[PDB]
Amino acid sequence: IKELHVKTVKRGENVTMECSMSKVKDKNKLAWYRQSFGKVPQYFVRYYSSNSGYKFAEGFKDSRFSMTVNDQKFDLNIIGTREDDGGEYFCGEVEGNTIKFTSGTRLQF
Amino acid sequence: IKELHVKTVKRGENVTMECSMSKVKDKNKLAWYRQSFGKVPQYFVRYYSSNSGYKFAEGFKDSRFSMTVNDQKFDLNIIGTREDDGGEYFCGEVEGNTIKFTSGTRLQF
């Protein structure tokens, strides 16, 4: 049972939340999930074969968010963190009938 | 964006956590996810094509858990809840490259 990284930030800081490509078997099934307090997690960005390597859920628009995607890394970034970024972020690969979460971060203020 | 049901329970109660079958494309794609504080979510029980209607994750052994699976209902039950059941539970439907969570409960002692 895998432990979350804890990132304590202040408003205006930058953050990168890590996820490894190392055991991934289908990058098309990799996505990042966000869970805010009192809500269900939600997928907000996934792998996308392209030069950037990712793509955002429909009508997720926040320019502060990006990703750094390559054969090692599937890393999620926030430039200019605000109190409302607070919550948990999980990186998950879908496999058959279930998803496996291989890492996640609790982002806190 | 779906709200979690927040239940305050006392030790030794029985709990039922809800999840509807009403829009499920492929029932085999449904599972329940446990997220303890500080941890990544983990699938621990799924729909199975059986009469009981569910199968535990290999490595999950906690006989206090069961499910009520019918044609309306993918509910999770615990008999004798204890403090360390505290945390979040999500019902997830795999639909492709991502999972959607249609339901979840937070249990608090």
Side-chain angles (χ1 to χ4, degrees), chain A residues 1-4 28-29 33 35 37-41 43 88 90 94 96-99 101 103-104 106, chain B residues 1-4 28-29 33 35 37-43 88 90 94 96-99 101 103 106:
Chain A
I1 212 101
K2 229 268 152 155
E3 204 84 54
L4 297 182
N28 294 279
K29 282 146 146 184
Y33 301 65
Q35 189 195 9
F37 183 79
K39 309 265 155 182
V40 119
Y43 130 76
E88 308 167 318
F90 321 113
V94 166
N97 299 313
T98 62
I99 192 159
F101 301 99
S103 56
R106 188 176 62 253
Chain B
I1 190 131
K2 199 108 154 54
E3 211 102 23
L4 278 186
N28 273 273
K29 295 302 177 213
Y33 295 74
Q35 194 229 340
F37 197 77
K39 255 98 178 183
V40 112
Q42 204 123 69
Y43 121 77
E88 293 169 347
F90 316 124
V94 164
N97 304 324
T98 66
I99 192 148
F101 299 97
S103 223
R106 175 165 148 248

Side-chain angles (χ1 to χ4, degrees), chain B residues 16-20 32 66-69 73-77:
Chain B
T16 289
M17 290 166 276
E18 309 175 297
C19 183
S20 181
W32 269 100
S66 63
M67 282 194 84
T68 302
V69 179
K73 261 181 203 216
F74 192 63
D75 306 346
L76 185 69
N77 317 113

Side-chain angles (χ1 to χ4, degrees), chain A residues 5-69:
Chain A
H5 315 269
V6 185
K7 282 185 160 63
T8 304
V9 288
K10 319 218 221 278
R11 130 250 305 167
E13 300 196 356
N14 292 353
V15 89
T16 287
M17 292 182 275
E18 289 174 307
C19 182
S20 173
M21 291 275 199
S22 92
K23 286 139 72 272
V24 171
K25 54 201 312 297
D26 173 17
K27 291 161 164 198
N28 294 279
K29 282 146 146 184
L30 257 188
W32 268 100
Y33 301 65
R34 189 185 181 165
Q35 189 195 9
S36 314
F37 183 79
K39 309 265 155 182
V40 119
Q42 182 137 306
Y43 130 76
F44 76 105
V45 68
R46 60 201 173 87
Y47 178 103
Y48 194 64
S49 161
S50 96
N51 290 285
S52 61
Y54 64 99
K55 196 277 208 48
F56 287 111
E58 250 105 75
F60 176 87
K61 272 181 284 307
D62 198 317
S63 37
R64 295 176 311 120
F65 287 79
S66 54
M67 290 208 64
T68 291
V69 172

